[PDB]
Amino acid sequence: ALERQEVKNPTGIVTDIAPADLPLEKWSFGNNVRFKNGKAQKALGHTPIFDTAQAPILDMFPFIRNNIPYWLLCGEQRMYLADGTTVVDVSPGGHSASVTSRWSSGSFNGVIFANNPSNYPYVLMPQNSGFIPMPNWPANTFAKRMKSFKNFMIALNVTQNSVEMPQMVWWSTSADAGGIPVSWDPTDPTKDAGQNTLADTNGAIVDGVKLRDSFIIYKEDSVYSMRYIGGLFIFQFQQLFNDVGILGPNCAIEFDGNHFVVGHGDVYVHNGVQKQSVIDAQVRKFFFSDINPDNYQRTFVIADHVNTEMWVCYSSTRSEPGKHCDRAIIWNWKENTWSIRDLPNVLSGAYGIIDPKVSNLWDDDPNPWDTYTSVWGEGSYNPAKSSMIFSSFQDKKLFLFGNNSTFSGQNFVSTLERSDIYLGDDRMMKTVSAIIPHITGNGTCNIWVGNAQVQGSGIRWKGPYPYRIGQDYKIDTKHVGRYIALKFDFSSEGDWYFNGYTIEMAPKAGMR
Amino acid sequence: ALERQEVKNPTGIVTDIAPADLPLEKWSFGNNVRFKNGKAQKALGHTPIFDTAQAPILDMFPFIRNNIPYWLLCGEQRMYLADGTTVVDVSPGGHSASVTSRWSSGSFNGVIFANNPSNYPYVLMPQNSGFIPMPNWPANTFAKRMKSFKNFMIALNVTQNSVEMPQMVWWSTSADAGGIPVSWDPTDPTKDAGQNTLADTNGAIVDGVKLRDSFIIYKEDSVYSMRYIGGLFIFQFQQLFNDVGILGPNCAIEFDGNHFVVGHGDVYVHNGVQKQSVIDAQVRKFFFSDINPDNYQRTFVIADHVNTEMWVCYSSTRSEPGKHCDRAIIWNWKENTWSIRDLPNVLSGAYGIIDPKVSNLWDDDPNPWDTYTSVWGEGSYNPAKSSMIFSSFQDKKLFLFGNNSTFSGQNFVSTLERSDIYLGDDRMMKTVSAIIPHITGNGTCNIWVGNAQVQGSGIRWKGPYPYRIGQDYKIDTKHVGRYIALKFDFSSEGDWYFNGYTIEMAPKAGMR
Amino acid sequence: LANPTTWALTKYPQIYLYGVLEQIYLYTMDEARSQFWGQKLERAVMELQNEENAADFASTRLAIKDIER
Known part of the structure; x- marks a missing residue:
């Protein structure tokens, strides 16, 4: 005389559809969790890194030189180069970078180029040990964005001679066989350097990203494509979309031959032919009501190829104006799920190989047994996997995300809540005798059970029930109600996997 | 001994199919409601905006200049420019616009152009603070429609020398780098300006809208496409459709790589290859019987990308001839649903970013608690989202649609009605003991229950039953009949979400 | 409230507890539990009455056969 209902692999958070209409395998609310392989796990933790450099860092770029990883960190006035052990200044002089003049950089013909909208572009050759001004660059010209494509360098949103x-x-010119382009003059008809204007809408060019064999240019309200054809015209221009654009720089990433783009009022995915929205009907209303009005330009997108995730980082309304991004929404493109996570007031991030330079030994190990840990064979350095590093400009810090299970020592709280469960019977009263969670790992969780009498109305919650992961089989309670609601609250100092649960109910208890 | 039937997420209004044949999840009739994410919600309310500008406004166009939004309002005889705080006159002299000479405008090479069929085109450069007649424009020439495509300006429905x-x-000629085109003469063979005539049907060109990488030209009875190929012919013309056309200007919108068009006797969607109707078998007969015969030319279409909706605004037969549009039908392209809405006698509308300039504070808040409201973190200005603004010419008013839940203070009534429900048994009589609605929010609703003995015949209704949202669980009644009918009437001063209901019936009461 | 304590409550609280539970389940319109608790209350009342009746065995015979003729 005891009924049982099993919920298996509930993943994703949906706030657009009313919670009474969601499938049994979805979460109505959550915070500080990740969804992967049908399991809900604790969100990644950050640890300090590069704790030997001075001045705030604006942008970061990883690369490999002389078979050694190297991170180029652009500051407000000087560059630095880091290898995991030492930080070396390589700036030529004093730059005028700021939060309104961000850095673009890349590689071209073996030369590493960097640029900001308030200085002439700088280059670094494999022979020199520091940056030099870009040769042949026209005077009194600044480029908001500078990129490299095939055998050309491209500048976007350009000011010249104070206009x-x-x-x-x-x-610029092709200038093959290595080196830098020898000229930028478009008026010369004996070279292939040239200019074009995409002026048929009031929007402005924001960014440009490669895609397969094309260069996608994002305006504020339209999307164009550029293709290289050679001949007498070199480049061919084609308009792709006229109804959507991009929000800002660093808001478009490429994955699996598609482009994930965050636009104005929508987040979509396109392959250059077909476009479709991925945020619709899941978190659209929630997301486009939390953007801080005074800071809707620090939003940026990063990618985690190993975990197959896209992070959209922004500044929520919980923060005062003038602060940087503090919240993030993570989308999983292999399972079509969304998650919400807090951030430690970061401004930019990068994805690349890093060596933390931490010895393993036996007598150099803080962080006792029940703190994440990894498999026995794995060490602190894994060259086969990349890692994410964020930079907090205002706090002047660099965070490496990953192994650690604490917010740099501090403990955070993860929550997962579902409401308005009635199992197809919205008249009788349910009893709910026990809850059997399926959690593997270490730590202690708290379970809250509540009931509601009218759909969407207030909920009467019951006191927290402790649950020891790995020892306790179930929690005992007695909660008569019409619509059931469950909340799982996980503390920190432990790693746990959560992949469903079971509700054990006594026979019904009337209909009023 | 109590049977229960649950209806989940009924959305959309269908009037073409007989109500006895509709699925259980459809509404036979309704008014002043919206359908979104499987929920039926109150229709949007309008609040007066720009209450400092004189003279009626004909057309409105938003754009961004100097990193600030600006709305250009083209009126009867003088332009105006608004920024949310002040209105500045920018007209050079006195125009001769009217309700039969509407304004077209756009951007080209950073220059904002405007035109009406009774004056020479005017331009506004970034340097100047006023409008100037277009240079090089041929004398005694007027263009009904003027648009911009790639590096050219296009004129359609053109009068010249009083013919x-x-x-x-x-x-016109192509534009290099920037500035306006230098010539418009087609006779000159050394330039790329030219003319063409699409004269094989009695219809006339009405409008032209971009689609992907082509320019779609709409006639009264056919649809053509033009594409830029360069070379010795510049443009290539291609006929697309011959059986449908367009109703009037501003009756074709672009969304997700498709075109939504309101034709003569049909409303369809096409991608340039395949065409299909979206109004057939839902509200076709109702729609093409309500347009005022004397005013079937003010109909216009607007788009809400955030809500993914298309508004068709027209003047219904309830209005005296000579008035402007007063009714609207809204189509949701993500769920394929239709809804009906009232309008405050508007003539034109626009979609763009607006800053109402309303302080939040604590002591400047009218509109008591149970009037819409938003989330706690949201303010009055959200740059990440757009808004809709309509203009009433005859009443000389500007309305902003959105947050407010009243028709500028006045309260309106929303209705939802379904009829002829018999649950597969059309011989015996049902009892209907109670109705359990699923409504979340605040306010009070009224429920009407009626029965009919013969399909399509008269209905005997029962007195209104009040229902308090959030407190009452159900309404109690007793109504014996063969075919059931339900009506929900929502007043104002509250926000409510409606996502289904349940019918509780006693055992049948014989077959007569 | 004006009479918080009575001898019946202090002598056998199960009677009042079961009666209140049965009334509650009658109010919430549940049928099985209401019947179950009603049977429990009836059994408790019968037990109390039986205990009272068998308090003195000698008096049981008397007060039964009176005036036959």
């Missing part, structure tokens, strides 16, 4: 114009794409 | 030719497409 600015954001709807011109400028490409 | 009108309504089937010419006229394109």
Whole structure:
């Protein structure tokens, strides 16, 4: 005389559909969790890294030189180069970078180029040990964005001779066989350098990203494509979309031959032919009501290829104006799920190989047994996997995300809540005798059980029930109600996997 | 001994199919409601905006200049420019616009152009603070429609030297780097300006809208496409459709790589290859019987990308001839549903970013608790989301649609009605003991229950039953009949979400 | 409230507890539990009455056969 209902692998958070209409395998609310392989796990933790450099860092770029990883960190006035042990200044002089003049950089013909909208572009050759101004660069010209494509360098949103114009794409000469382009003059008809203007809408060019064999250019309200054809015209221009654009720089990533883009009022995915929205009907209303009005330009997107995730980082309304991004929504493109996570007031992030330089030994191990840990064979350095590093400009810190299970020592709280469960019977009263969780790992969780009499109305909650992961089989309670609601609250100092549960109910108890 | 039948997420209004044949999840009739995410919600309310500008406004166009939004309002005889705080006159002199000479406008090479069929085109440069007549414009020439495509300006439905030719497409010379085109002469063979005539049907060009990488030209009875190929012919013309056309200007919108068009006797969607109707078998007969015969030319279409909706605004037969649009039908392209809404006698509308300039504070808050409201973190200005603004010419008013839940203070009534429910048994009589609604929010609703003995015949209704949202669980009644009918009437001063209900019936009461 | 304590409550609280539970389940319109608790209350009342009746065995015979003729 005891009924049982089993919920298996509930993943994802949906706030657009009313909780009474969601399938049994979805969460109505959550915080500080990840969904992967049908399991809900604790969100990743951050640890300090590069704790030997001075001045705040704006942007970061990883690369490999001389078979050694190297992170180029652009500051407000000087560059630095880091290898995990030492930080070396390589800046030529004093730059005028700021939060309104961000850095673009890349590689071209073996030369590493960097640029900001308030200085002439700088280059670094394999022979030199420092940056030098870019040769042949025209005087009194600044480029908001600078990128490399095939055998060309491209400038976007260009100011020249104190008059600015954001709807011109400028490409230099091919200049093959290594080296830097020898000229940028478009007026010369004996070379292949040229200019074009995408001026048919009031929007302005924001960013440009490669995709397969094309260069996608994102305006504020439209999306164009550039293709290289050679001949007498070199480049061919084609308009792709006219109804959506991009929110800001670093808001478009490439994965599996598609582009994930965060636009104005929508988040979509396109392959250059077909476009479809991925945030609709899941977290759309929640997301486009939490953006801080005074800071809707620090939003940026990062990618985790190993975990197959896309992070959208932004500044929520919980923070005062003037602060940087503090919240993030993570989308899993292999399972189509969303998650919400807190951030430690970061401004930019990067994905690349890093060596923390931490010895293993036996007598150099803080963080006692029940703190994440990894498999026995794995060490602190894994060259086969990348890692994510964020930079907090205002707090002047660099965080490496990953192994650690604490917010740099501090403990955080993870929550998962579902409400309005009635199992197809919205008249009788349910009893709910026990809850059997399926959690593997270490730590202690708290379970809250509540009931509601009218759909969408207030909920009467019952006191927290402790549950020891790995020892306790179930928690005992007695909660008569019409619509059931469950809340799982996980503390820190432990790693846990959560992949469903079971509700054990006594026979019904009337209909009023 | 009590049977229960649950209806989950009924959305959409269908009037073409007989109500006895509709699925259980559809509404036979309704008014002043929206359907979104499987929920039925109160229709949007309008609040007066720009209550400092004189003279009626004909057309509105938003854009961004100097990193600030600006709305250009083209009125009867003088332009105005608004930024949310002040209105500045920018007209050079006195125009001769009217309700039969509407304004077209756009951007080209950073220059904002405007035009009406009774004046020479005007331009506004970034340097100047006023409008100037277009240079190089041929004398004694007027264009009903003027648009921008790639590096060209296009004129359609053109009169010249007191003879009108309504089937010419006229394109000027290409524009290099920036600035306005230098010539419009087609006779000169050393330039790329030219003319073409789409004269094989009695119809006339009405409008032209971009689609992907082509320019779609709409006639009264056919649809053509133009594409830029360069070379010796510049443009290539291609006929698409011959059986449908367009109803009037501003009756074709682009969304997700498709075109939504309101034709003569049909409303369809096409991607340039395949065409299909979206209004058939839902509200077709109702819609094409309600347009005022004397005003079937003010109909216009607007788009809400955030809500993914298309509004068709027209003047219904309830209005005296000579008035503007007063009714609207809204189509949701993500769920394929239709809804009906009232309008406050508007003539034109626009979609763009607006800053109402309303302080939040604590002591400047009218509109008591149970009036819509938003989330705690949200303010009055959300740059990440757009808004809809309509203009009433005859009443000389500007309305912003959105947050407010009243028709500018006045309260409206929302209705939802379904009829002829018999649950597969059309011989015996049902009892109907109670109705359990699933409504979340605040306010009070009224429920009407009726029965009919013969399909499609009269209905005997029962007195209104009040229902307090959030407190009452059900309403109690007793109504014996063969075919059931339900009506829900929502007053105002509250926000409510409605996502289904349940019918509780006693055992049948014989077959007569 | 004005009479918080009575001899019946202090002598056998199960009677009052079961009666209140049966009344509650009658109010909430549940049938099986109401019948169960009603049977429990009836059994408790019968037990109390039986204990009272068998308090003195000698008096049981008397007060039964009176005036036959």
